Short mmCIF file of C-alpha atoms in Angstrom, two decimals:
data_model
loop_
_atom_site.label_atom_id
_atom_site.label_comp_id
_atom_site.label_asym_id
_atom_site.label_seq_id
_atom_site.Cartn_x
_atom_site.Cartn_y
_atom_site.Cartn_z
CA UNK A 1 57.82 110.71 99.63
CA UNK A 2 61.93 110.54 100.14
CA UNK A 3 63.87 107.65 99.64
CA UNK A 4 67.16 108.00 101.51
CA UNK A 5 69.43 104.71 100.01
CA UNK A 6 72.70 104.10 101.48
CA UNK A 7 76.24 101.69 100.99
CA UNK A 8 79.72 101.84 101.74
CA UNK A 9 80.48 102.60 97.87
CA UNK A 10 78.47 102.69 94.15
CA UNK A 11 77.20 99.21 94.76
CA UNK A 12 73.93 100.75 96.11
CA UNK A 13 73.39 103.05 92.74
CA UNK A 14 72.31 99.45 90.71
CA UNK A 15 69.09 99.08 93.53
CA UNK A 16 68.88 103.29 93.12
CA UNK A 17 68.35 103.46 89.43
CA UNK A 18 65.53 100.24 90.12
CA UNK A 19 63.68 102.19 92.63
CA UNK A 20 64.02 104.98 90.30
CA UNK A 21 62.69 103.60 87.21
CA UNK A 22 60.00 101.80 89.37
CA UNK A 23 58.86 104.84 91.89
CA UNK A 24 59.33 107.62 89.17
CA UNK A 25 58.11 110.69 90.68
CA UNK A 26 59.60 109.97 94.47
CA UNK A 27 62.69 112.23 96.06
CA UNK A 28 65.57 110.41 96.47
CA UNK A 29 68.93 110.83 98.41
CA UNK A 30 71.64 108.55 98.26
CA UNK A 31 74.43 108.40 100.44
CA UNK A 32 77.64 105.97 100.09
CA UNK A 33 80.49 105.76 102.69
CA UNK A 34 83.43 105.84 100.92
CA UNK A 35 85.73 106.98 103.75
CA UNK A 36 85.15 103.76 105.55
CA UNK A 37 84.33 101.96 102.06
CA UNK A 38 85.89 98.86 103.13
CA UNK A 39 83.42 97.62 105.39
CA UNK A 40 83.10 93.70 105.02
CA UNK A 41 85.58 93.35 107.27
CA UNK A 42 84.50 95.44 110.00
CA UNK A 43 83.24 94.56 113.51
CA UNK A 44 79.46 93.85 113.88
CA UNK A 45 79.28 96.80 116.28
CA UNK A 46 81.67 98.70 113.72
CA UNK A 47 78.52 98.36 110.78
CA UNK A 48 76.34 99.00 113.22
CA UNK A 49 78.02 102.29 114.04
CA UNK A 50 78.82 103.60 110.32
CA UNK A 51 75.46 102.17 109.50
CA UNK A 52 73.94 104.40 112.92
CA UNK A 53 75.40 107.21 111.44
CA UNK A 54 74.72 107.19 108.07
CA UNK A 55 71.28 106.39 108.64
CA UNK A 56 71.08 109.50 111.16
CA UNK A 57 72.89 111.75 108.09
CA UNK A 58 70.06 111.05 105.76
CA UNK A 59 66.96 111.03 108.73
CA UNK A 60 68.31 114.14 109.42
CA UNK A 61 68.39 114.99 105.41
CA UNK A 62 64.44 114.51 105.90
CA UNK A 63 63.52 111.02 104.02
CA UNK A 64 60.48 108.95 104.69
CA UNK A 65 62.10 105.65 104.81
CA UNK A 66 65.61 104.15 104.56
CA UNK A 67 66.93 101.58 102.29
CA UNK A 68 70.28 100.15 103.29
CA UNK A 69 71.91 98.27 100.16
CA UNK A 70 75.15 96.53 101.89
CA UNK A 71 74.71 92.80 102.80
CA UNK A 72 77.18 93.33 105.55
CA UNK A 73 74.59 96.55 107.27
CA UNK A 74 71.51 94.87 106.75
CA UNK A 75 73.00 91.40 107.95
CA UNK A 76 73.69 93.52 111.65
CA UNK A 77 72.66 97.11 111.66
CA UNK A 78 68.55 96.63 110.90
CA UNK A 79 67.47 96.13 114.34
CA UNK A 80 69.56 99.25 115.60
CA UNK A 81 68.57 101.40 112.48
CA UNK A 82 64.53 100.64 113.23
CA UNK A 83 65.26 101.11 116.96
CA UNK A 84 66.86 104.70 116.69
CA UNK A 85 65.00 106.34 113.38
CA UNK A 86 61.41 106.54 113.66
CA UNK A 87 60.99 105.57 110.03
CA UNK A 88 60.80 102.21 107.81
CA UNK A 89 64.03 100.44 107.27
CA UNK A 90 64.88 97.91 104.16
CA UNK A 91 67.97 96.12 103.72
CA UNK A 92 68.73 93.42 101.12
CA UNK A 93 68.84 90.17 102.71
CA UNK A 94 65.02 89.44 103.44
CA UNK A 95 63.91 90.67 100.23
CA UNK A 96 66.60 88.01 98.19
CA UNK A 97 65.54 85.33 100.37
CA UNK A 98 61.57 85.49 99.63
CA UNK A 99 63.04 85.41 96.25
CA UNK A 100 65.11 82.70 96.37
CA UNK A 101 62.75 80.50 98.72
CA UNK A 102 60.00 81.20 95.46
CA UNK A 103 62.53 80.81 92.66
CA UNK A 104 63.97 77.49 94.11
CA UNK A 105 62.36 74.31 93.07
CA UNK A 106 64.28 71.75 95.37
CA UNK A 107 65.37 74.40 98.14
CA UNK A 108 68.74 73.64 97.81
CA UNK A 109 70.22 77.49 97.19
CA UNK A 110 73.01 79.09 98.47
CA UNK A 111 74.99 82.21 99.18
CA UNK A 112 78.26 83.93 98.37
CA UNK A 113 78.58 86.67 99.89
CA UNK A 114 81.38 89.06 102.16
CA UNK A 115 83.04 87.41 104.87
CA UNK A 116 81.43 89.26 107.66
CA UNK A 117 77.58 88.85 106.22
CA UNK A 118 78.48 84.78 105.60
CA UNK A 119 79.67 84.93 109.41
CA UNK A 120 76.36 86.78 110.45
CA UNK A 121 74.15 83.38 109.49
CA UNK A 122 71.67 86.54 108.60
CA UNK A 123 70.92 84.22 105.05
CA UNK A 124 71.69 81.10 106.18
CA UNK A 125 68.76 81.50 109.01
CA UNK A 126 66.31 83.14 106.77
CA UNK A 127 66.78 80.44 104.68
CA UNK A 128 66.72 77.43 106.85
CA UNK A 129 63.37 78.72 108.60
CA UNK A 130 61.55 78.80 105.04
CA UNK A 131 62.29 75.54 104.45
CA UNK A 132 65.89 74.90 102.42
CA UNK A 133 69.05 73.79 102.36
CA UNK A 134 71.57 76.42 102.13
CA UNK A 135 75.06 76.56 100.78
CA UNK A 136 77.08 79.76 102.18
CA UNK A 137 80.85 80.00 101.19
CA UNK A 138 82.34 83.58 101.31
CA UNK A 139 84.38 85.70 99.01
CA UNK A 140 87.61 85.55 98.43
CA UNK A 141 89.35 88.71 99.09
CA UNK A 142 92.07 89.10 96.42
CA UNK A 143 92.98 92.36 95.34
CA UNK A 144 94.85 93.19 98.18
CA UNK A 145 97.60 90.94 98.37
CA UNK A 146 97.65 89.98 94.51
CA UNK A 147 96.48 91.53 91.28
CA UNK A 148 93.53 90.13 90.24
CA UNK A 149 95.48 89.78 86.75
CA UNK A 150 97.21 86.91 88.15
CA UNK A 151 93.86 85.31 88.63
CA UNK A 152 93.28 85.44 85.15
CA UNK A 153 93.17 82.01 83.20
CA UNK A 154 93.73 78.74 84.52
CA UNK A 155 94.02 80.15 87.95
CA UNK A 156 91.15 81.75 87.64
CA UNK A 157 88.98 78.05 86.13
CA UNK A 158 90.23 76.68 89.61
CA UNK A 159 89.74 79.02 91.76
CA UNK A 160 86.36 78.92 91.19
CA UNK A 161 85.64 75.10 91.70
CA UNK A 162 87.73 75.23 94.55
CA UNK A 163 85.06 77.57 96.29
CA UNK A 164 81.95 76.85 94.56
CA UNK A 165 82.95 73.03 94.99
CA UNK A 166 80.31 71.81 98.15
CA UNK A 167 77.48 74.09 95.21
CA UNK A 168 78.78 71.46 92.24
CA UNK A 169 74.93 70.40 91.14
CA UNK A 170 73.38 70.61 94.31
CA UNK A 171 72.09 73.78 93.96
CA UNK A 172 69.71 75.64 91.81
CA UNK A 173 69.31 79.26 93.04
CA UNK A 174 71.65 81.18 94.17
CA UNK A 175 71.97 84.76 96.24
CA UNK A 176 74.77 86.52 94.69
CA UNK A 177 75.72 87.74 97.62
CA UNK A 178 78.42 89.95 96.56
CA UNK A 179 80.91 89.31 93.67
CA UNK A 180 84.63 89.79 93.56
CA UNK A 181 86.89 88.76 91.31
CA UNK A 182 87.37 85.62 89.91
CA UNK A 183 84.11 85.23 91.23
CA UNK A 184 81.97 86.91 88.42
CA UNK A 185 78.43 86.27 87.72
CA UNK A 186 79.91 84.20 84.50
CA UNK A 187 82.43 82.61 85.97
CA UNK A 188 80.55 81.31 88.43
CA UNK A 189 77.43 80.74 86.26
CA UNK A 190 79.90 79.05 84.04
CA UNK A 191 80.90 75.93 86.46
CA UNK A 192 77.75 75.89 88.02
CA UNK A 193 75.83 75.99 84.75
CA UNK A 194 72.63 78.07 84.18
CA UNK A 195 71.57 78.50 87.73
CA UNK A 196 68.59 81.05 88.61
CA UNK A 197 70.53 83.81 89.99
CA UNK A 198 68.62 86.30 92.46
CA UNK A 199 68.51 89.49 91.16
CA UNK A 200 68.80 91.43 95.00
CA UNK A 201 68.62 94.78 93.55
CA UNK A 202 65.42 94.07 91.46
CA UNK A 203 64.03 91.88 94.37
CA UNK A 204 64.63 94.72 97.14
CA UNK A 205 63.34 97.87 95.06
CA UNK A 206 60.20 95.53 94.20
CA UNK A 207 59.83 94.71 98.14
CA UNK A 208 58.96 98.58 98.87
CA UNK A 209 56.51 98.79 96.95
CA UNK A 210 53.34 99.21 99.99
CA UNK A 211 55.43 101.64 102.16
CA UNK A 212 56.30 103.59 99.17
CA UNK A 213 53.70 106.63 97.65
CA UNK A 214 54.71 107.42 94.54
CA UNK A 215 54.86 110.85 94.74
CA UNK A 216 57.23 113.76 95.10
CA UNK A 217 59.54 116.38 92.89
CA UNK A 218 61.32 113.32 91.53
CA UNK A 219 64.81 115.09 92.68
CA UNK A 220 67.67 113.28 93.22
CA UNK A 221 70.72 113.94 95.48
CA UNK A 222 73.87 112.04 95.33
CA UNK A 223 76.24 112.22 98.81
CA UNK A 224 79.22 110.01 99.99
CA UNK A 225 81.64 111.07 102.57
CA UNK A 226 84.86 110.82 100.50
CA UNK A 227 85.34 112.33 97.42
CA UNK A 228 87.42 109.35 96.41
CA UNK A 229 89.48 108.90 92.96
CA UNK A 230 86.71 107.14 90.03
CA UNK A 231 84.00 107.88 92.29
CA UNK A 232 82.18 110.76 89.83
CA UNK A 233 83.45 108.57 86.71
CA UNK A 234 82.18 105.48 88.06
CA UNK A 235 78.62 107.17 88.52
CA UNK A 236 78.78 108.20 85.27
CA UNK A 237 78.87 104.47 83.74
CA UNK A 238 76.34 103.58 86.08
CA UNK A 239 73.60 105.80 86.04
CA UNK A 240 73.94 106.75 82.33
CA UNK A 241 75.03 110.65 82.35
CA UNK A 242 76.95 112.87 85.02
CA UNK A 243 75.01 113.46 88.01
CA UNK A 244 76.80 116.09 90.56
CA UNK A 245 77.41 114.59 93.93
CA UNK A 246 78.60 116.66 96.90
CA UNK A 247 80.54 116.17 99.87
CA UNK A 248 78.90 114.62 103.39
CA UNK A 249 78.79 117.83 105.76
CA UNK A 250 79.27 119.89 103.00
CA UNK A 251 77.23 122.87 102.30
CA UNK A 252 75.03 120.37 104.27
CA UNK B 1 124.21 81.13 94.83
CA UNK B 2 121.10 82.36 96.65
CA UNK B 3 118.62 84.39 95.04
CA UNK B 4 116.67 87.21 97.32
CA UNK B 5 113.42 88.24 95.57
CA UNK B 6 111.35 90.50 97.31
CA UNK B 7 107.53 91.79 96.42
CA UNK B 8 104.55 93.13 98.27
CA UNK B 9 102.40 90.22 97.89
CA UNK B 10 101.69 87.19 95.42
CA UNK B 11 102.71 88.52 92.10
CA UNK B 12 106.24 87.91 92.23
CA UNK B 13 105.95 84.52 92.89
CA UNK B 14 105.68 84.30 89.03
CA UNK B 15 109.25 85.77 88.13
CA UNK B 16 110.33 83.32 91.19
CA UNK B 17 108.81 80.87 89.19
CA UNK B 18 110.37 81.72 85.91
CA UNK B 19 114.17 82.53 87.33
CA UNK B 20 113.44 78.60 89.16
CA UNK B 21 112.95 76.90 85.90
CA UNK B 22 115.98 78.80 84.26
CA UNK B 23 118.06 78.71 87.05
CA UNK B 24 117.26 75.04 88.10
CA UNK B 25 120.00 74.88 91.33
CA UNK B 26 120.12 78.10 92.54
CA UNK B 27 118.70 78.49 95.94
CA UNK B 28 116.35 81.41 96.99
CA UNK B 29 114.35 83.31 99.58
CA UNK B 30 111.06 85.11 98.82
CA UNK B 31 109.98 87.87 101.01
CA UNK B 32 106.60 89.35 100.14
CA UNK B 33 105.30 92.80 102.19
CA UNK B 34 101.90 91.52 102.87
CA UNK B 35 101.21 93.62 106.12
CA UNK B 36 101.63 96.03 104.03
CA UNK B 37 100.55 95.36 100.99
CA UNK B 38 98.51 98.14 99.55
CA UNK B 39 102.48 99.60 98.33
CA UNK B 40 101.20 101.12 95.16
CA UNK B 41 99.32 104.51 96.96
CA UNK B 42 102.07 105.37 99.45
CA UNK B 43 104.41 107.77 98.75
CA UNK B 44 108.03 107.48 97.40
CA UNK B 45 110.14 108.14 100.57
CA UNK B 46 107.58 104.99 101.82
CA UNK B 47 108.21 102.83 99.06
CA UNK B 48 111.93 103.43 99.76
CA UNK B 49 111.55 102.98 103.47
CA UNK B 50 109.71 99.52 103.20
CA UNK B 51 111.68 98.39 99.63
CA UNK B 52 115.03 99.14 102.06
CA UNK B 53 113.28 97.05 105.12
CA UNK B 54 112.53 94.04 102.71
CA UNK B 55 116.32 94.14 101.29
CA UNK B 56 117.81 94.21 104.57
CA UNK B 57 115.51 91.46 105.58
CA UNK B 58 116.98 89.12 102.40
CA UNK B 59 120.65 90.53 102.84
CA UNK B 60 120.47 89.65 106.54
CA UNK B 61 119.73 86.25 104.99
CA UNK B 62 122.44 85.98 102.81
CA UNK B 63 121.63 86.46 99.64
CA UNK B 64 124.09 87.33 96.51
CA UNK B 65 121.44 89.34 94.37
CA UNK B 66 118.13 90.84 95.16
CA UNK B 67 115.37 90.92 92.65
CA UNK B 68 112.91 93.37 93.23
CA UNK B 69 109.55 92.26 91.06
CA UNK B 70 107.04 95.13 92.35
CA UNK B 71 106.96 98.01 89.69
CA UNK B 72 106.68 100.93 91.79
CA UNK B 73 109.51 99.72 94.49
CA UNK B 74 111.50 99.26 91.22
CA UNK B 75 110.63 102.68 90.32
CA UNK B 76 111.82 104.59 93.48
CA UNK B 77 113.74 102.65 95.62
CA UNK B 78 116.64 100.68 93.32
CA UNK B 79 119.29 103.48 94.06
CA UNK B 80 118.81 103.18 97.66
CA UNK B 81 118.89 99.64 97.78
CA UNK B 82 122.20 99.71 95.51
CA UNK B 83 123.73 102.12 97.72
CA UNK B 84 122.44 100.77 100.84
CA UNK B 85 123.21 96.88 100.15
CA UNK B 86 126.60 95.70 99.23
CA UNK B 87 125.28 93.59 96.20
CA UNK B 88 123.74 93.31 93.34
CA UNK B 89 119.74 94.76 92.78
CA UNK B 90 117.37 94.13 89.92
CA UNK B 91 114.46 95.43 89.08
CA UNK B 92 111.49 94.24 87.03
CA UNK B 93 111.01 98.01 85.25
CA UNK B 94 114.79 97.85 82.86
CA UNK B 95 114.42 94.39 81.57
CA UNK B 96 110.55 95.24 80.54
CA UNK B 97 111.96 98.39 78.43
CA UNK B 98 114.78 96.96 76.57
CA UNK B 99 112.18 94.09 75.73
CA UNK B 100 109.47 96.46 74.59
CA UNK B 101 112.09 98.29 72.58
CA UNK B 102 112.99 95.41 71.26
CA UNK B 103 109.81 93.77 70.33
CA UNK B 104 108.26 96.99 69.11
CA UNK B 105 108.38 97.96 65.24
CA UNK B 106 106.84 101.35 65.34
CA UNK B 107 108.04 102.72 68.38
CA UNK B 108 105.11 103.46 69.69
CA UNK B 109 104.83 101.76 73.06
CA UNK B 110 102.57 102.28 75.88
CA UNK B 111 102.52 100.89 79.71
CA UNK B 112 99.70 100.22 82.06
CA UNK B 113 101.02 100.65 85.21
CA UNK B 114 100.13 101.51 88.88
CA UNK B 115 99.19 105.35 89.96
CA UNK B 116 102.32 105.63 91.80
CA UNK B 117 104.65 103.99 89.23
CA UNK B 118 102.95 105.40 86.65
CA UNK B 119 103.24 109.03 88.42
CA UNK B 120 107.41 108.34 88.94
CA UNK B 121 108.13 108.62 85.20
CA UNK B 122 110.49 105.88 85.07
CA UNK B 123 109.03 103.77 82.19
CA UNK B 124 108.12 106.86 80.29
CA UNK B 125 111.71 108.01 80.66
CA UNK B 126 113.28 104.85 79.78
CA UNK B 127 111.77 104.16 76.49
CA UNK B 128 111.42 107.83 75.66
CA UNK B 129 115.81 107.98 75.84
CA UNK B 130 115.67 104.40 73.86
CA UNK B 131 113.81 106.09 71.19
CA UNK B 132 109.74 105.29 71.43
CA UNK B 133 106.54 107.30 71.97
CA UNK B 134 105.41 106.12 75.62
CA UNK B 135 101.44 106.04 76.03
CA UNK B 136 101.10 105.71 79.73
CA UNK B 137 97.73 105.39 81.53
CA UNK B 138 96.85 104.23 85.36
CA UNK B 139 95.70 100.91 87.04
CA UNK B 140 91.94 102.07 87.79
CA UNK B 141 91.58 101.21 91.61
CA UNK B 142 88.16 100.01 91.66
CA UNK B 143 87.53 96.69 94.27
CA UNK B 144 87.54 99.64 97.35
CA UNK B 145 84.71 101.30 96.04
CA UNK B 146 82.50 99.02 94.30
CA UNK B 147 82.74 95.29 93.52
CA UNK B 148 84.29 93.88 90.23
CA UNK B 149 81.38 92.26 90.13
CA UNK B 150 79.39 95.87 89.22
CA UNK B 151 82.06 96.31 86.66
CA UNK B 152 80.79 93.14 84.33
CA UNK B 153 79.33 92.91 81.02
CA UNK B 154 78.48 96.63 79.29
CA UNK B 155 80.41 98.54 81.63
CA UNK B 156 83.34 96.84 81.57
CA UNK B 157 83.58 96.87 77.64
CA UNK B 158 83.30 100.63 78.11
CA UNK B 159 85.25 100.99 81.22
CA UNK B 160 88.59 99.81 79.24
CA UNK B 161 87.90 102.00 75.75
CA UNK B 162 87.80 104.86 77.87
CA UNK B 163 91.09 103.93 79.55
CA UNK B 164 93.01 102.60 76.36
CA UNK B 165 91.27 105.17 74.24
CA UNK B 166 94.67 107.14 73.41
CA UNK B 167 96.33 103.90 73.22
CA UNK B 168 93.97 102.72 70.71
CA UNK B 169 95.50 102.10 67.15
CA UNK B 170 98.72 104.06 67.93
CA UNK B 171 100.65 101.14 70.06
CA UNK B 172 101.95 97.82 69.03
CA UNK B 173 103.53 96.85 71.99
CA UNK B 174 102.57 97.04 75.52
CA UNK B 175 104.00 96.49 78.65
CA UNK B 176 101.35 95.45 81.26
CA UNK B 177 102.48 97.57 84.21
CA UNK B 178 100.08 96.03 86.31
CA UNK B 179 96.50 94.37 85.59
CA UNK B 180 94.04 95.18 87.72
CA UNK B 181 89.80 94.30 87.23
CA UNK B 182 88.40 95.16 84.28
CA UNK B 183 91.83 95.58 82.92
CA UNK B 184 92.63 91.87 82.66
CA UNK B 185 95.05 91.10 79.82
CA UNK B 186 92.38 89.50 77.68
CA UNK B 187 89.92 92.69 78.30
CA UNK B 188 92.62 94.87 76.66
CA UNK B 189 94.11 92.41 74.16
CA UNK B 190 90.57 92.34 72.77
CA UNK B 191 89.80 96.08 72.74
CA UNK B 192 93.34 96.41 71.23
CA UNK B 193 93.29 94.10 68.97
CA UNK B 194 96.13 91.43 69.30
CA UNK B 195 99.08 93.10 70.59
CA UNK B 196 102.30 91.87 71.62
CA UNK B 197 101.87 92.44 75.26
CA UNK B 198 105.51 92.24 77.41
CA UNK B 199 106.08 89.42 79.34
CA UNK B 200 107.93 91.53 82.06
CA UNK B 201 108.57 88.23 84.52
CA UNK B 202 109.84 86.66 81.47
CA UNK B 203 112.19 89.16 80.72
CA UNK B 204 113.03 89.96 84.23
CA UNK B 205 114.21 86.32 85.21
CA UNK B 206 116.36 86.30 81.85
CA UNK B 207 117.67 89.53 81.97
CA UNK B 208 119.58 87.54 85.17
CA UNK B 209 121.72 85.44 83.35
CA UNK B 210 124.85 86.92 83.91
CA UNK B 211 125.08 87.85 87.18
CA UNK B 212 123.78 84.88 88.49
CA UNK B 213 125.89 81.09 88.84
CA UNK B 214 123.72 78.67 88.44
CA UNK B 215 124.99 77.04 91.62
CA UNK B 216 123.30 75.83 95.07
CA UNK B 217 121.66 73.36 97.16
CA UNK B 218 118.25 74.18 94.78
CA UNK B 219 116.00 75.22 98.13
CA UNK B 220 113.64 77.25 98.30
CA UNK B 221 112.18 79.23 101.36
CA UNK B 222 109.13 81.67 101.27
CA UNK B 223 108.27 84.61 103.94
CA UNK B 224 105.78 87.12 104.17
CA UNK B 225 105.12 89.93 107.00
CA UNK B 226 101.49 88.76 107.19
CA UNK B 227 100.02 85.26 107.06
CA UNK B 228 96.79 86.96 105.37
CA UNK B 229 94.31 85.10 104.96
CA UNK B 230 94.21 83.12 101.52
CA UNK B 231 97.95 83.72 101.45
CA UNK B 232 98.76 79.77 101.57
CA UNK B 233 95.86 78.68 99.08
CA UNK B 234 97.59 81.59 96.35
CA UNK B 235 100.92 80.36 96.87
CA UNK B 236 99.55 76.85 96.02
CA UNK B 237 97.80 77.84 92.93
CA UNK B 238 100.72 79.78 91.19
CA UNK B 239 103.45 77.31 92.63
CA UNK B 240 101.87 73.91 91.74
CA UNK B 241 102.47 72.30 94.88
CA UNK B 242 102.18 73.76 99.03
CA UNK B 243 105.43 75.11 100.00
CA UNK B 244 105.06 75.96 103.99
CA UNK B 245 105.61 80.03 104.45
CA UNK B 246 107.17 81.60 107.54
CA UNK B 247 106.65 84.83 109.54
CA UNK B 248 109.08 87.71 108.69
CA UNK B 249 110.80 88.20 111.99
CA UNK B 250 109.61 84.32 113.22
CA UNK B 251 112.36 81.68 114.19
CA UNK B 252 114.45 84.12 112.22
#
């Protein structure tokens, strides 16, 4: 048994170290896109392309099954992945919705989550056809134009309620979709007040668990197409110690 | 008296603010690059290509003076603009050195800047030939690969030590180049320790006074190259009120 994970960036290495922990003798392979990185903003058939490939990149890299991470792949590139690799494919979405239709207790949850997923109506759907009332609103990208620095402090108090306003104390789970500044789990879980938050990454690794034999060298390879600045110090912090990663169509 | 400012994005809108309240009936013209605005990773001969573009744009509109609040334009392109406009150009990188020499006790001074500011020398120069040990260090460019949001809690404690680790007890004034997530000024003013941190808009908008006749018809007109998308709902946030933008190169 392989795993082959893969995202646009280091997102995916939270869900990675879960499967990991959980499935502790399986092979893995993980493989993040950071020459395209930002990808929320991308055409549908755009993630359906990158996500074509990079799917292809690990079949071909010999893994049992295929775990996409990114909100915005698995909100449009699942049928396409299933369609063109002969093997099981997981993204994130379906797994965080079980989760939040169980967690919920009035059915009134919502969503943050990128632009392009929010557009999808991927959660919304799930959602609605399980019986609750969601909330979407997407994120706000900032970095960009300003630094989030100028965000910080009373901006920041406002931006927040400004976004999560429709969510005031309707709500009681939420999918944290995907968080960007000012947007923070405790900002957010600040205005809104303790809220059951869906863990996506716990809730997808957990969701494998009947395709997945645990079983194999318990290796574990670590590819992304750009060797891009903090990548290898960023992996560091999140994994625990230095694991070598190597260069998409490298040595191959 | 009109007063030009010019910036890639948002984040001058706070000197803007600050020269406004001084200089209550001066008139002005913003003109922020946001079709470009990633400025901080292009090169210098870029930054001096779109910093003389922008300057042109404002002299073209009459201005007297042209304040220039992005660090790393201020950090290649002021001699062009000097020699290249027939008037008066100031820079946000000068006032924030004489303050930090000023405000420092010690000496011992260090600035948080952007890569490509950081990598011109200027502010390391500066308060080097003023007399102080500079302690420079980079923005870490992190929304691109992975979300802020992976950057909360634990790692972000350990994210900013790492950073600020030669910085550590040996400053006692800082000059806060440019904050970018996890960086936030209350992030490093914690790890730190209370430090007198620069107020480089502040200083800027001050450093003003003579040059500038507090005279005019007190308007105020905003452009950008790009009506991104939460452009309007920024400018409302730092401003305190909606002040209607235009398109660089619109009605004209």
């Amino acid at each position: 048994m392989k795993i082959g994970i893969f995202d646009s960036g280091v997102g995916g290495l939270t869900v990675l170290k879960a499967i990991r922990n959980r499935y502790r003798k399986v092979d893995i392979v993980y493989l993040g896109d950071t020459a395209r990185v930002p990808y929320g903003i991308r055409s549908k058939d755009t993630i359906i392309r990158y996500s074509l490939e990079c799917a292809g990149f690990l079949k071909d890299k010999g893994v049992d099954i295929i775990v996409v991470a990114c909100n915005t792949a698995s909100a449009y590139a699942l049928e396409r992945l299933k369609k063109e690799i002969n093997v099981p494919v997981f993204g994130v979405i379906e797994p965080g919705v079980k989760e939040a239709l169980k967690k919920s207790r009035n059915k009134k949850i919502g969503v943050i989550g990128t632009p392009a997923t929010v557009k999808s109506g991927a959660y919304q759907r799930k959602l609605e056809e399980g019986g609750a009332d969601v909330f979407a609103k997407a994120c706000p990208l900032f970095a960009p134009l300003a630094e989030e620095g100028l965000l910080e402090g009373e901006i920041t108090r406002k931006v927040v309620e400004h976004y999560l306003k429709e969510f005031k104390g309707k709500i009681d789970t939420l999918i944290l979709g995907c968080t960007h500044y000012p947007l923070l789990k405790k900002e957010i879980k600040k205005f809104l007040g303790d809220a059951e938050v869906v863990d996506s990454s716990e809730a997808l690794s957990l969701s494998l668990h009947n395709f997945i034999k645990d079983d194999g060298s318990s290796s574990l390879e670590l590819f992304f197409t750009d060797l891009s600045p903090n990548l290898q110090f960023l992996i560091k912090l999140i994994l625990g110690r230095d694991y070598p990663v190597k260069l998409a169509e490298g040595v191959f």
